[PDB]
Amino acid sequence: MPAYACQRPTPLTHHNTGLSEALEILAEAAGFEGSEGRLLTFCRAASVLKALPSPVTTLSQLQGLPHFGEHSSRVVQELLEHGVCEEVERVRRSERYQTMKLFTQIFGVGVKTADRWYREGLRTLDDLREQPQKLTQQQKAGLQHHQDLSTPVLRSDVDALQQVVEEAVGQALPGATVTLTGGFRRGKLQGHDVDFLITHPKEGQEAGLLPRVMCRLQDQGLILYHQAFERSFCIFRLPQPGSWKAVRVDLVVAPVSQFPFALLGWTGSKLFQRELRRFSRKEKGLWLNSHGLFDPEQKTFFQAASEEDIFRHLGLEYLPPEQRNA
DNA sequence: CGGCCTACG
DNA sequence: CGTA
DNA sequence: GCCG
Ligand SMILES: Nc1nc2c([nH]c(=O)n2[C@@H]2O[C@H](COP(=O)(O)OP(=O)(O)OP(=O)(O)O)[C@@H](O)[C@H]2O)c(=O)[nH]1
Ligand SMILES: [Mn+2]
Ligand SMILES: [Mn+2]
Ligand SMILES: [Mn+2]
Ligand SMILES: [Mn+2]
Ligand SMILES: [Mn+2]
Ligand SMILES: [Mn+2]
Ligand code: NA
């Protein structure tokens, strides 16, 4: 089993959900306590189990697996022996974990903000609403639309949103294209948001596009929240039968020279992409981001025509999006 | 021991 | 900091 | 927490 998540296929449906979900609780809790390193190990260990071909039924089956040491192995051992891990259950039931999960799931609130509020004694969304001076405009929007943003986004919603984004993009720039990215491109049936990547086949024509698209959406009444720019993390007023619901939408514009890199980056998964970028730098000496792949010794960028080209230049077997669910 | 993805808003 |  |  390869050590990096970008070296192995990880399908959407896999055989060790119970074990991986427990390790991901410990990862999330490690993040809440400010240890990104422990979060990463627990995330990596969870993802190793997602890549296995069969259910783990014996502790024996972990031997040699990357990112399984004493702590992650003990969690699996307890789950196999007893069906529950005491440490996981203690974190699950804790006021700190529950509140930090509640606050960080708000759009505009991360760990550092949530931790400050926790330390000030706040515990509920009504507590935050009662203290509105404590909130940025982004946080006000996330709180205002929190109920809708907690409702899974479905494929029906994606299709409707892609049509209205395509209409605005076509009005803003003839020939520009819209590509669905994020979890839906990896095959997920649900999501917390919809992600779109916009480009134009003629390099340079996309300059200034995203403000024009946003103006056209805003004047059709489709925008509840947004804020030269090339990324917009929006909330849309999506029409529904007789009504509407708020939906998070991410819009990104890239020049066509960068489109394979942006498509790769925005397709995820989040762990897959951080592993790929780690692999690129640490194993291949190349610097990867959503704009390009840089060789820092020759001072040159790799010209890619496809995602496949990027994998090949990194010496990796190509993985289609549905196998990037690390 | 120290690293842990990487930008833009 | 937030996007996460 | 695990690993180079
Ligand atoms: N399901 C869900 N996910 C949420 C909420 N709030 C929130 O921040 N998230 C975050 O949403 C991210 C994954 O959502 P997603 O379904 O869009 O997956 P994705 O791979 O496209 O992630 P991406 O859109 O962040 O790139 C996670 O990092 C998770 O922390 C929420 O209320 N529900
Ligand atoms: Mn026991
Ligand atoms: Mn998404
Ligand atoms: Mn995500
Ligand atoms: Mn840029
Ligand atoms: Mn150390
Ligand atoms: Mn440590
Ligand atoms: Na958040």
Length reported for chain A: 326
| Residue A6 near residue A307, CB atoms below 8 Å | no
User: A46's torsion region: left (phi>0), alpha (psi -120 to 50) or beta?
Assistant: alpha
Q: Side chain identity at A244, as an amino acid letter? A: W
Residue A192, ligand 1, Cβ within 6 A:
yes
Do A104 and A31 belong together in one domain?
Answer: no
Q: Is A126 annotated as a binding residue?
A: no
Given A94, A112, A139, the domain boundary residue is: A94
Q: How many domains does chain A have?
A: 4
Nearest residue: Cα versus C1' of B6: A289
Domain of residue A132 covers: 95-151
Query: How many Cα atoms are found within 13 Å in the side-chain-facing hemisphere of A192?
Result: 8
| Residue A200 near residue A206, CB atoms below 8 Å | yes
Given A75, A94, A113, the domain boundary residue is: A94
How is residue A144 written in tokens? Answer: 């205002």
Give A57 CA → C1 C1' in Å.
44
Reduce the DSSP state of residue A191 to 3 states and report it.
Answer: strand
| Residue A266 near residue A181, CB atoms below 8 Å | yes
Cα angle, residue A282 at apex, residues A280 and A285 outer, rounded to 5°: 65
Q: Is A157 annotated as a binding residue?
A: no
* Elucidation technique: X-ray
Q: How far is CA A284 from CA A66, A223, A277, A301, A311, in A?
A: 20, 43, 10, 14, 12
Ligand 7 centroid to residue A36 C-alpha, Å:
10
- Residue with CA nearest ligand 1 atom 26: A182
Do A6 and A90 belong together in one domain?
Answer: yes
- Residue with CA nearest ligand 1 atom 2: A192
Give, to the nearest 10 degrees, the angle between helix A70-82 and helix A36-50.
Answer: 50
Do A60 and A6 belong together in one domain?
Answer: yes
Closest CA to A56 of A28, A23, A87: A23
Ligand 5 centroid to residue A193 C-alpha, Å:
22
**DSSP H/E element including A300:** strand A300-301
Q: How far is CA A239 from CA A69, A271, A313, in A?
A: 50, 33, 44
Q: Is A295 annotated as a binding residue?
A: no
Which of A127, A148, A250, A309 is labelled catalytic? Answer: A250
How far, in Å, CA of A2 to CA of A305, rounded? 27
How far, in Å, CA of A264 to CA of A254, rounded? 12
How is residue A36 written in tokens? Answer: 């990104």
How far, in Å, CA of A264 to CA of A179, rounded? 12
Is A127 designated active site? no
Contacts 24+ apart (CB under 8 A), A235-240: A235/A107, A235/A141, A235/A145, A235/A149, A236/A161, A236/A164, A238/A157, A238/A160, A238/A161, A239/A160
Residue A269, ligand 1, Cβ within 6 A:
yes
Do A158 and A237 belong together in one domain?
Answer: yes
- Residue with CA nearest ligand 1 atom 18: A183
Closest CA to A182 of A248, A278, A105, A111: A248
Ligand 5 centroid to residue A291 C-alpha, Å:
7
Residue A268, ligand 1, Cβ within 6 A:
yes
Among A193, A245, A248, A267, residue to substitute to test ligand 1 (most atoms within 8 Å of Cβ) = A193
Hey, which residues does A228 pair with through a beta bridge? none
How far, in Å, CA of A3 to CA of A47, rounded? 10
Do A69 and A86 belong together in one domain?
Answer: yes
Given A116, A132, A151, the domain boundary residue is: A151
**DSSP secondary structure string, A225-259?**
E----SEEEEEEEEEETTEEEEEEEEEEE--GGGH
Q: How far is CA A51 from CA A12, A27, A48, A70, in A?
A: 10, 18, 5, 20
Ligand 2 centroid to residue A87 C-alpha, Å:
12
Do A156 and A169 belong together in one domain?
Answer: yes
Query: How many Cα atoms are found within 13 Å in the side-chain-facing hemisphere of A194?
Result: 25
| Residue A46 near residue A23, CB atoms below 8 Å | yes
Do A83 and A16 belong together in one domain?
Answer: yes
Is A159 designated active site? no
Determine if strand C comes within 7 Å of the CB of A289.
Answer: no
Is A193 designated active site? yes
Do A232 and A275 belong together in one domain?
Answer: no
Q: How far is CA A181 from CA A123, A184, A191, A194, A322, in A?
A: 35, 6, 11, 8, 12
How is residue A62 written in tokens? Answer: 């972990």
Hey, which residues does A249 pair with through a beta bridge? A194, A234
Sign of the alpha-carbon torsion through A93, A98, A101, A102: positive
Do A290 and A217 belong together in one domain?
Answer: no
Question: Residue ranges of the alpha helices (H) in chain A?
Answer: 17-32, 36-50, 70-82, 86-92, 95-104, 111-119, 125-129, 137-144, 146-149, 155-172, 182-185, 209-219, 259-267, 270-284, 307-313
Position in ligand 1 atom list of the atom nearest CA A195: 24
Determine if strand C comes within 7 Å of the CB of A217.
Answer: no
Do A173 and A206 belong together in one domain?
Answer: yes
| Residue A234 near residue A251, CB atoms below 8 Å | yes
Hey, which residues does A196 pair with through a beta bridge? A180, A251
Do A88 and A127 belong together in one domain?
Answer: no
Do A145 and A157 belong together in one domain?
Answer: no
Q: Which nucleotides of D are covered by protein (CB under 7 A)?
A: 1-4
| Residue A75 near residue A85, CB atoms below 8 Å | yes
Resolution in A, one decimal? 1.5
| Residue A326 near residue A5, CB atoms below 8 Å | yes
> For chain A, what is the radius of gyration of the CA atoms?
21
Q: What is the DSSP letter of A315?
A: T
